[PDB]
Amino acid sequence: SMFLPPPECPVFEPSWEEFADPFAFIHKIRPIAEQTGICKVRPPPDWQPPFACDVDKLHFTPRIQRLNELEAQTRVDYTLRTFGEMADAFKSDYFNMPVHMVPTELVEKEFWRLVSTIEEDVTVEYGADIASKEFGSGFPVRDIKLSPEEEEYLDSGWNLNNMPVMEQSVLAHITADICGMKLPWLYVGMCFSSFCWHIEDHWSYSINYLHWGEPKTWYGVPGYAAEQLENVMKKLAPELFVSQPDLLHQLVTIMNPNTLMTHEVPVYRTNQCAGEFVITFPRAYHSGFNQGFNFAEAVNFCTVDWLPLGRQCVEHYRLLHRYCVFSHDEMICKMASKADVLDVVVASTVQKDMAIMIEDEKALRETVRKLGVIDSERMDFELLPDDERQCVKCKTTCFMSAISCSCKPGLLVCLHHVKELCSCPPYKYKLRYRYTLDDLYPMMNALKLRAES
Ligand SMILES: [Cl-]
Ligand SMILES: [Mn+2]
Ligand SMILES: [Zn+2]
Ligand SMILES: [Zn+2]
């Protein structure tokens, strides 16, 4: 009747020993948590990173949010004090209650009532921005003089500034600019402010820490059910699935988990409270809303487990004509070029992906040669701005190779779309390539040597 809450997602309480290495721990829980898409992690009781900031000197510009189920939203001045004041009064006036007295069950039930009710037009506000000098990480960072307590947490793997640049992560090695993806984002919530159903770019992981305040309610769907969910959503809201001109135009929406559950899409929930982590796994759809005034911090990351999925994601982007945040192949080759300093399990896993890359590239080059492309020239793709090396047809970011024609200066197609560049015969085309196959096999060999050492 009305709202039936989804079953709870897994909750882990690691020992200090398990907690010592976040990537080992994530690998450990993966068999369980990937079945549910999201999971919650409670740190050991004494892991307590100090939060300190001036509520009057932290400023941000809030985003306005209408709360209508199935309505399209785009994916991407208050002080913290004045926002908090607004947020508390909003919740307090909404329920005619003190905020700590409003049961989380009630806020959840009411959220799903108000987004589905046409006659209600509740609007709320929220903050979402990357860490900057005007608004920095909630975790300790080096800058000016820090307390010993802050020093304790400076190097923690669970300090979300460090997570991107550890010895078992992959996004670290990327030299290309992916700031929107590798830097933590800060989120200031209020009652009912929400995040629409989405998956992370390049099907990466994400990890979210609620620094303080009232809980954040989550819904998650396991990666295996991603296409099921999309099919449900495309039937109910086809507008969200029209082609989009860039990454700054991704359309997303609020949708009741019971609707998914009715269509046999598995959905899990949780209330993330202050001091708790939520982890989302590759291609796991998630959404949620805040219970009240709060402050969270989140970052994307990629494990070695993720590498094959990363490759599959870019393939999927190609099929959908979606823009890439970075070139997956460029990242693989960057790591190969640093094989000697790579962690050994990383080296072994990159070697396997590189082997697929090379064999695919071989087949593509044979195919375009048979189409009559004969001329070729080496090209350092990584030097081109992204918007100068996207395939005309499928928008993929080129790196291994592309086709050009003097007919249309500056334009490129990837080797899947040789026929989509221009009307000139293929003998007028050039194969532009980053590496010969003969360059590539020794690169892969270096990884092998590092891996077997
Ligand atoms: Cl509404
Ligand atoms: Mn997310
Ligand atoms: Zn293409
Ligand atoms: Zn041409």
Coordinates of C-alpha atoms and ligand atoms in Angstrom, one line a residue:
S1 CA 0.0 0.0 0.0
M2 CA 1.6 3.2 -1.2
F3 CA 5.4 2.6 -0.5
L4 CA 6.9 -0.8 0.2
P5 CA 10.5 -0.2 1.1
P6 CA 13.1 -2.3 -0.8
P7 CA 15.0 -4.9 1.2
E8 CA 18.1 -3.6 3.0
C9 CA 21.5 -3.6 1.1
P10 CA 24.5 -5.4 2.8
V11 CA 26.1 -3.7 5.7
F12 CA 29.7 -4.4 6.6
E13 CA 31.5 -3.6 9.9
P14 CA 35.2 -4.4 9.1
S15 CA 37.7 -4.9 11.9
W16 CA 40.7 -2.6 12.1
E17 CA 42.6 -5.3 10.3
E18 CA 40.2 -5.6 7.4
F19 CA 39.8 -1.8 7.3
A20 CA 43.5 -1.2 7.0
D21 CA 43.4 -1.7 3.2
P22 CA 40.3 -0.3 1.5
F23 CA 41.0 -2.0 -1.9
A24 CA 41.6 -5.4 -0.3
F25 CA 38.4 -5.0 1.7
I26 CA 36.4 -3.9 -1.4
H27 CA 37.8 -6.9 -3.2
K28 CA 36.7 -9.1 -0.3
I29 CA 33.1 -7.9 -0.1
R30 CA 32.7 -7.7 -3.9
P31 CA 31.1 -11.2 -4.3
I32 CA 28.3 -10.1 -1.9
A33 CA 28.0 -6.4 -2.7
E34 CA 28.0 -6.7 -6.5
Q35 CA 24.8 -8.7 -6.2
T36 CA 23.1 -5.7 -4.7
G37 CA 24.9 -2.8 -6.5
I38 CA 25.4 -0.8 -3.3
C39 CA 26.6 -1.6 0.2
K40 CA 27.2 0.3 3.4
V41 CA 30.5 0.3 5.3
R42 CA 30.7 1.2 9.0
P43 CA 34.3 2.0 10.0
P44 CA 35.7 0.7 13.3
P45 CA 34.3 2.8 16.2
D46 CA 37.4 4.8 16.8
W47 CA 38.1 5.7 13.2
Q48 CA 36.9 9.2 13.5
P49 CA 38.3 11.7 11.1
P50 CA 38.1 15.2 12.5
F51 CA 35.7 17.6 10.7
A52 CA 36.3 21.3 11.1
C53 CA 35.3 24.3 9.0
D54 CA 33.9 27.8 9.4
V55 CA 30.2 27.8 8.6
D56 CA 30.3 31.5 7.7
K57 CA 33.3 31.4 5.3
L58 CA 32.2 28.5 3.3
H59 CA 30.0 29.8 0.4
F60 CA 28.3 28.0 -2.5
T61 CA 25.7 28.4 -5.1
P62 CA 22.8 26.0 -4.7
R63 CA 21.0 24.1 -7.5
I64 CA 17.2 24.3 -7.5
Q65 CA 15.3 21.1 -7.7
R66 CA 11.7 20.3 -8.6
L67 CA 10.4 17.1 -7.1
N68 CA 8.4 15.3 -9.9
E69 CA 8.7 11.6 -10.6
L70 CA 9.7 10.8 -14.2
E71 CA 10.4 14.5 -15.0
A72 CA 13.7 15.1 -16.8
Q73 CA 16.6 16.7 -14.9
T74 CA 20.1 17.5 -16.1
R75 CA 22.9 15.7 -14.3
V76 CA 25.3 18.6 -13.7
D77 CA 24.5 32.1 -2.9
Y78 CA 24.4 30.5 0.6
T79 CA 26.9 30.1 3.4
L80 CA 26.9 26.7 5.0
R81 CA 25.2 28.5 8.0
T82 CA 22.4 30.2 6.0
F83 CA 21.8 27.0 4.0
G84 CA 21.5 25.1 7.2
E85 CA 19.1 27.7 8.6
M86 CA 16.9 27.4 5.4
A87 CA 17.1 23.6 5.4
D88 CA 16.1 23.1 9.0
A89 CA 13.2 25.6 8.8
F90 CA 12.0 23.9 5.6
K91 CA 11.9 20.5 7.2
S92 CA 10.5 21.9 10.5
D93 CA 7.7 23.7 8.7
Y94 CA 7.0 20.9 6.4
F95 CA 6.1 18.4 9.1
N96 CA 5.3 20.9 11.9
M97 CA 7.8 19.0 14.0
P98 CA 11.3 19.3 15.4
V99 CA 13.7 17.7 12.8
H100 CA 15.0 14.8 15.0
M101 CA 11.6 13.8 15.7
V102 CA 10.6 13.2 12.1
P103 CA 11.0 9.4 11.6
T104 CA 13.1 8.3 8.6
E105 CA 10.3 5.9 7.5
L106 CA 8.0 8.9 7.4
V107 CA 10.3 11.1 5.3
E108 CA 10.8 8.2 2.9
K109 CA 7.1 7.5 2.6
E110 CA 6.4 11.2 2.1
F111 CA 9.1 11.7 -0.5
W112 CA 7.5 9.1 -2.7
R113 CA 4.1 10.5 -2.1
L114 CA 5.1 14.1 -3.1
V115 CA 7.1 13.2 -6.2
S116 CA 4.1 11.2 -7.6
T117 CA 1.5 13.8 -6.7
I118 CA 0.8 16.3 -9.5
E119 CA -0.9 18.8 -7.3
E120 CA 2.3 19.2 -5.1
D121 CA 5.1 21.3 -6.5
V122 CA 7.7 21.2 -3.7
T123 CA 11.0 22.7 -4.7
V124 CA 14.2 22.2 -2.8
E125 CA 17.9 23.3 -3.1
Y126 CA 21.2 21.6 -2.7
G127 CA 25.0 22.0 -3.1
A128 CA 27.2 19.9 -5.4
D129 CA 30.7 21.0 -6.3
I130 CA 34.2 19.6 -6.6
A131 CA 36.7 20.5 -3.8
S132 CA 38.2 23.9 -4.4
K133 CA 40.0 26.7 -2.5
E134 CA 36.6 28.3 -1.9
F135 CA 35.2 25.0 -0.6
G136 CA 37.5 22.2 0.3
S137 CA 37.5 18.5 1.2
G138 CA 35.9 17.4 4.5
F139 CA 38.9 15.2 5.1
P140 CA 42.3 16.4 6.3
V141 CA 44.7 17.6 3.6
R142 CA 48.2 19.0 3.7
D143 CA 48.6 22.8 3.8
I144 CA 48.1 25.4 7.5
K145 CA 49.5 23.7 10.6
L146 CA 47.5 20.5 11.4
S147 CA 46.8 18.8 14.7
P148 CA 48.1 15.2 15.4
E149 CA 44.5 13.9 15.1
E150 CA 44.3 15.3 11.5
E151 CA 47.7 13.9 10.8
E152 CA 46.5 10.4 11.8
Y153 CA 44.0 10.6 8.9
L154 CA 46.1 12.4 6.3
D155 CA 47.2 9.2 4.7
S156 CA 44.3 6.9 5.3
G157 CA 43.1 5.0 2.2
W158 CA 39.6 5.9 3.3
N159 CA 40.4 9.6 3.3
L160 CA 38.7 10.2 -0.1
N161 CA 41.4 12.5 -1.4
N162 CA 43.9 9.6 -1.2
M163 CA 41.6 6.9 -2.7
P164 CA 42.2 8.1 -6.3
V165 CA 46.0 7.8 -6.0
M166 CA 46.7 4.5 -4.3
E167 CA 48.8 1.5 -5.6
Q168 CA 45.7 -0.6 -6.5
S169 CA 43.7 2.1 -8.2
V170 CA 43.8 2.9 -11.9
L171 CA 42.4 6.4 -12.5
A172 CA 45.5 7.7 -10.8
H173 CA 47.8 7.0 -13.7
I174 CA 45.7 9.0 -16.1
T175 CA 47.7 12.1 -17.2
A176 CA 44.8 13.4 -19.2
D177 CA 42.5 15.9 -17.5
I178 CA 39.6 14.1 -15.8
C179 CA 39.1 16.5 -12.9
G180 CA 35.3 16.1 -12.8
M181 CA 36.0 12.4 -12.3
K182 CA 39.1 12.1 -10.0
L183 CA 38.6 14.9 -7.5
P184 CA 36.2 14.5 -4.6
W185 CA 32.8 16.3 -4.9
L186 CA 31.1 17.9 -1.9
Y187 CA 27.4 17.7 -1.4
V188 CA 25.3 19.8 1.0
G189 CA 21.9 18.2 1.4
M190 CA 18.5 19.2 2.8
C191 CA 15.2 17.3 3.4
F192 CA 14.0 15.7 0.0
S193 CA 17.0 17.0 -2.1
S194 CA 17.7 14.1 -4.3
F195 CA 20.0 12.4 -6.8
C196 CA 18.3 10.9 -9.8
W197 CA 18.9 7.3 -11.1
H198 CA 22.3 7.1 -12.7
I199 CA 25.5 5.0 -13.1
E200 CA 29.0 6.4 -12.9
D201 CA 31.0 7.5 -16.0
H202 CA 32.9 4.7 -17.5
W203 CA 31.0 2.3 -15.2
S204 CA 33.5 3.2 -12.4
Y205 CA 33.0 2.6 -8.7
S206 CA 32.1 5.4 -6.3
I207 CA 32.4 5.7 -2.6
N208 CA 30.5 8.3 -0.6
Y209 CA 31.2 9.4 3.0
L210 CA 28.6 11.2 5.1
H211 CA 30.6 13.6 7.2
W212 CA 27.8 14.8 9.4
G213 CA 24.0 15.6 9.6
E214 CA 20.9 13.6 9.0
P215 CA 20.9 10.5 7.0
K216 CA 21.1 10.0 3.2
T217 CA 18.6 7.4 1.9
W218 CA 19.9 5.2 -1.0
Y219 CA 18.4 2.9 -3.6
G220 CA 20.7 0.6 -5.6
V221 CA 20.4 -1.9 -8.4
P222 CA 23.1 -4.5 -9.1
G223 CA 25.2 -4.1 -12.3
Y224 CA 23.8 -7.2 -13.9
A225 CA 20.3 -5.6 -14.0
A226 CA 21.4 -2.3 -15.6
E227 CA 19.8 -3.0 -18.9
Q228 CA 16.6 -4.3 -17.3
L229 CA 16.3 -1.0 -15.4
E230 CA 17.0 1.0 -18.6
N231 CA 14.3 -0.9 -20.4
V232 CA 11.8 -0.1 -17.7
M233 CA 12.7 3.5 -17.7
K234 CA 12.7 3.9 -21.5
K235 CA 9.1 2.6 -21.6
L236 CA 8.0 5.0 -18.9
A237 CA 10.1 8.1 -19.9
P238 CA 11.4 7.7 -23.5
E239 CA 12.4 11.4 -23.6
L240 CA 15.4 10.6 -21.3
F241 CA 16.8 8.4 -24.0
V242 CA 17.1 10.8 -26.9
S243 CA 20.6 11.4 -28.2
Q244 CA 22.5 14.0 -26.3
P245 CA 25.1 16.5 -27.8
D246 CA 27.6 16.2 -24.9
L247 CA 28.3 15.0 -21.3
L248 CA 26.8 18.2 -20.0
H249 CA 23.4 17.2 -21.3
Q250 CA 22.8 13.7 -19.7
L251 CA 19.1 13.5 -18.8
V252 CA 18.1 11.7 -15.6
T253 CA 15.0 11.3 -13.4
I254 CA 13.4 10.4 -10.1
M255 CA 11.6 7.0 -10.2
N256 CA 9.9 5.0 -7.5
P257 CA 11.8 1.8 -6.6
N258 CA 8.5 0.0 -6.3
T259 CA 8.0 0.6 -10.1
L260 CA 11.3 -1.2 -10.7
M261 CA 10.3 -4.0 -8.3
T262 CA 7.0 -4.5 -10.0
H263 CA 9.0 -5.1 -13.2
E264 CA 11.2 -7.6 -11.5
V265 CA 14.2 -5.3 -11.3
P266 CA 16.0 -6.1 -8.0
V267 CA 16.4 -2.9 -5.8
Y268 CA 18.0 -2.5 -2.4
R269 CA 17.9 0.4 0.1
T270 CA 19.8 1.8 3.0
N271 CA 19.9 4.8 5.3
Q272 CA 23.5 6.1 5.3
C273 CA 24.1 7.9 8.6
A274 CA 26.9 10.3 9.6
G275 CA 30.3 8.5 9.7
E276 CA 29.2 5.8 7.3
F277 CA 30.4 4.9 3.8
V278 CA 28.3 3.8 0.8
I279 CA 30.1 2.1 -2.1
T280 CA 28.6 1.7 -5.5
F281 CA 29.9 -1.0 -7.8
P282 CA 30.4 -0.9 -11.6
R283 CA 27.3 -0.2 -13.7
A284 CA 25.2 -0.2 -10.5
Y285 CA 22.2 2.1 -10.8
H286 CA 21.6 4.3 -7.8
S287 CA 19.4 7.1 -6.6
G288 CA 18.3 8.6 -3.3
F289 CA 17.4 11.7 -1.3
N290 CA 18.6 13.4 1.9
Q291 CA 16.6 13.2 5.2
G292 CA 17.7 16.6 6.3
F293 CA 20.6 19.1 6.4
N294 CA 23.8 17.2 5.8
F295 CA 27.3 17.2 4.3
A296 CA 28.8 14.4 2.2
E297 CA 31.8 13.8 0.0
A298 CA 32.2 11.4 -2.8
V299 CA 34.8 10.3 -5.4
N300 CA 35.0 7.8 -8.3
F301 CA 37.6 5.1 -8.5
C302 CA 38.6 2.1 -10.6
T303 CA 40.1 -1.2 -9.4
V304 CA 41.9 -3.8 -11.5
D305 CA 38.6 -5.8 -11.3
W306 CA 37.1 -3.0 -13.3
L307 CA 39.5 -2.9 -16.3
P308 CA 37.6 -5.4 -18.5
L309 CA 34.3 -3.5 -17.6
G310 CA 35.9 -0.2 -18.5
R311 CA 36.7 -1.6 -22.0
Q312 CA 33.1 -2.9 -22.3
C313 CA 31.7 0.4 -21.3
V314 CA 33.6 2.3 -24.0
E315 CA 32.3 -0.2 -26.5
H316 CA 28.8 0.5 -25.2
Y317 CA 29.4 4.2 -25.4
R318 CA 30.3 3.7 -29.1
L319 CA 27.1 1.8 -29.8
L320 CA 25.2 4.7 -28.2
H321 CA 27.2 7.6 -29.6
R322 CA 28.0 8.8 -26.1
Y323 CA 31.1 10.9 -25.4
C324 CA 33.9 9.5 -23.4
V325 CA 35.5 11.2 -20.4
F326 CA 38.9 9.7 -21.4
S327 CA 40.4 7.2 -23.7
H328 CA 40.5 3.8 -22.1
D329 CA 43.2 2.6 -24.5
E330 CA 45.3 5.7 -23.8
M331 CA 45.1 4.9 -20.1
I332 CA 46.2 1.3 -20.8
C333 CA 49.2 2.4 -22.9
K334 CA 50.2 5.0 -20.3
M335 CA 50.3 2.3 -17.7
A336 CA 52.3 -0.1 -20.0
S337 CA 54.8 2.8 -20.5
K338 CA 55.2 2.8 -16.7
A339 CA 55.3 -1.0 -16.3
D340 CA 58.4 -1.0 -14.1
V341 CA 56.8 1.1 -11.3
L342 CA 53.4 -0.6 -11.5
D343 CA 52.1 -2.8 -8.7
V344 CA 52.5 -6.4 -9.8
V345 CA 48.8 -7.5 -9.8
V346 CA 48.0 -4.2 -11.6
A347 CA 50.7 -5.1 -14.2
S348 CA 49.3 -8.5 -14.7
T349 CA 45.7 -7.2 -15.1
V350 CA 46.7 -4.4 -17.5
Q351 CA 48.6 -7.0 -19.6
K352 CA 45.5 -9.0 -20.1
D353 CA 43.4 -6.0 -21.2
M354 CA 46.2 -4.8 -23.5
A355 CA 46.3 -8.2 -25.1
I356 CA 42.6 -7.8 -26.0
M357 CA 43.2 -4.3 -27.2
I358 CA 46.1 -5.4 -29.5
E359 CA 44.2 -8.3 -31.0
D360 CA 41.1 -6.1 -31.6
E361 CA 43.3 -3.4 -33.2
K362 CA 45.0 -5.9 -35.4
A363 CA 41.6 -7.1 -36.8
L364 CA 40.4 -3.5 -37.3
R365 CA 43.5 -2.5 -39.3
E366 CA 43.2 -5.6 -41.5
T367 CA 39.6 -4.6 -42.2
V368 CA 40.3 -1.0 -43.2
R369 CA 43.3 -2.1 -45.4
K370 CA 40.8 -4.4 -47.3
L371 CA 38.6 -1.4 -47.7
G372 CA 41.3 0.3 -49.7
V373 CA 43.0 2.6 -47.2
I374 CA 46.6 2.3 -48.0
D375 CA 48.5 5.5 -46.9
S376 CA 49.3 5.7 -43.2
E377 CA 51.1 8.1 -40.8
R378 CA 51.9 7.8 -37.1
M379 CA 50.0 10.3 -34.9
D380 CA 50.4 11.3 -31.3
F381 CA 46.6 11.3 -30.5
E382 CA 47.2 12.1 -26.8
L383 CA 48.4 15.6 -27.8
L384 CA 45.1 16.5 -29.4
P385 CA 42.3 18.1 -27.3
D386 CA 39.5 15.6 -26.9
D387 CA 37.2 17.6 -29.2
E388 CA 39.7 17.3 -31.9
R389 CA 39.9 13.5 -31.8
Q390 CA 36.3 12.3 -31.6
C391 CA 34.9 10.0 -34.2
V392 CA 32.5 12.0 -36.4
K393 CA 29.9 9.1 -36.2
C394 CA 30.1 7.5 -32.8
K395 CA 31.9 10.3 -30.8
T396 CA 34.5 7.8 -29.3
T397 CA 37.8 9.4 -28.2
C398 CA 40.4 8.1 -30.6
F399 CA 43.8 6.9 -29.5
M400 CA 44.9 3.6 -31.1
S401 CA 44.0 4.8 -34.6
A402 CA 41.7 6.8 -36.8
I403 CA 41.0 7.6 -40.5
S404 CA 41.4 11.1 -42.0
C405 CA 40.9 12.6 -45.4
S406 CA 42.5 15.8 -46.9
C407 CA 39.0 16.5 -48.1
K408 CA 37.8 17.3 -44.5
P409 CA 40.7 18.7 -42.6
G410 CA 40.7 18.0 -38.9
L411 CA 37.9 15.4 -39.0
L412 CA 38.4 11.8 -37.9
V413 CA 36.5 8.6 -37.7
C414 CA 37.4 5.5 -35.7
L415 CA 38.1 2.3 -37.6
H416 CA 34.5 1.2 -37.1
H417 CA 33.2 4.0 -39.2
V418 CA 35.6 4.3 -42.2
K419 CA 32.5 4.8 -44.4
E420 CA 31.2 7.8 -42.4
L421 CA 34.0 10.3 -43.0
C422 CA 33.3 11.6 -46.6
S423 CA 32.4 10.7 -50.1
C424 CA 36.0 10.4 -51.4
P425 CA 37.3 6.9 -52.4
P426 CA 39.2 5.1 -49.6
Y427 CA 42.6 5.4 -51.4
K428 CA 42.4 9.2 -50.6
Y429 CA 42.3 8.3 -46.8
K430 CA 45.2 8.0 -44.3
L431 CA 45.3 5.6 -41.4
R432 CA 46.6 7.6 -38.5
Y433 CA 47.9 5.4 -35.7
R434 CA 49.6 5.9 -32.4
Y435 CA 51.7 2.6 -32.5
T436 CA 52.7 0.0 -35.0
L437 CA 51.7 -3.6 -33.8
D438 CA 55.5 -4.1 -33.6
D439 CA 55.7 -1.2 -31.1
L440 CA 52.9 -2.7 -29.0
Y441 CA 54.1 -6.2 -28.3
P442 CA 57.3 -5.1 -26.5
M443 CA 55.1 -2.7 -24.4
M444 CA 53.0 -5.7 -23.4
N445 CA 56.2 -7.7 -22.7
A446 CA 57.4 -5.2 -20.1
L447 CA 54.1 -5.7 -18.2
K448 CA 54.7 -9.5 -18.4
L449 CA 58.2 -9.2 -17.0
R450 CA 57.0 -6.9 -14.2
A451 CA 54.1 -9.3 -13.5
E452 CA 56.2 -12.4 -13.2
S453 CA 58.9 -10.9 -11.1
Ligands
CL1 CL 5.1 16.6 -7.4
MN2 MN 26.6 8.3 -8.2
ZN3 ZN 33.3 5.7 -34.6
ZN4 ZN 37.3 13.1 -48.4

